[PDB]
């Protein structure tokens, strides 16, 4: 027929879906260094997904891992471990 007519196909310019920083990586309650990245330095509160930036699945995994570590003696509850205060800041929140 007419060669210049459009053709049905998938979007070639579609950018790959953005992946959470923890996508594809195992979250373990023993990895207190990683879990401490998602808790408040001063109050120990677990940050929300709007702060962490994680997906729902990884947010739930982080939450359950933090609770397990706190109850099993791996992680403090009321504050962030001082040994992990200088770890990379992966949470979108500034207090000062």
């Amino acid at each position: 027929s007419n060669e210049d007519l459009p053709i049905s196909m998938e979007n070639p310019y579609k950018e790959p879906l953005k992946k959470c920083i923890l996508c594809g990586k195992h979250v373990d309650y023993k990895n207190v260094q990683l879990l401490s990245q998602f808790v408040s330095p001063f109050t120990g509160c677990i940050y929300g997904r709007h702060i962490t930036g994680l997906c729902g699945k990884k947010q739930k995994e982080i939450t359950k891992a933090i609770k397990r570590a706190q109850i099993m003696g791996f992680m403090p509850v009321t504050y962030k471990d001082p040994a992990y205060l200088k770890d990379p800041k992966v949470c979108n929140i500034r207090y000062r």
């Binding site: 790959p16 879906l17 953005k18 992946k19 959470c20 996508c23 594809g24 195992h26 373990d28 309650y29 023993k30 997906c55 699945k57 397990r68 706190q70 099993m72 003696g73 791996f74 992680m75 403090p76 509850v77 471990d81």
Partner: protein, 122 residues
């Protein structure tokens, strides 16, 4: 099933720690567990003070016992660890490596919800 016993033992000298680990692994074997590995996480100050057997512990030695035990042995092992005096705190979990991580394509965006209210003029 495959379980991982996370164990916090009282900070003791090497002979006492070795004896306690041997006793715990022997108890696991007696209850039927096949111990696969014993991993030492080192001795560290506890995140918070723990009062176990009328004694306040500030430091503890962290170990992991990966094993395969019948479902009925978990309760008995929990009771045994509760009765033990050298164990600050022992918790048996299902082995994290058992649960395979499903592949994630990426964060699928959520479009703004539509047609929640009738388009009649207000």
């Amino acid at each position: 099933p495959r379980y991982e016993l996370a164990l916090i033992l009282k900070a003791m000298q090497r002979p006492e720690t070795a004896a306690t680990l041997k006793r715990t692994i022997e108890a696991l074997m007696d209850r039927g567990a096949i111990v696969r590995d014993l991993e030492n996480l080192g001795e560290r100050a506890l995140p918070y003070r723990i009062s176990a057997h009328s004694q306040q512990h500030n430091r503890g030695g962290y170990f992991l016992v990966d094993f395969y035990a019948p479902t009925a042995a978990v309760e008995s092992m929990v009771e045994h660890l509760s009765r033990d005096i050298d164990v600050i705190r022992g918790n048996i979990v299902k082995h994290p490596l058992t649960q395979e991580l499903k592949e994630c394509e990426g964060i699928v965006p959520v479009p703004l919800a539509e047609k929640l209210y009738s388009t009649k003029k207000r």
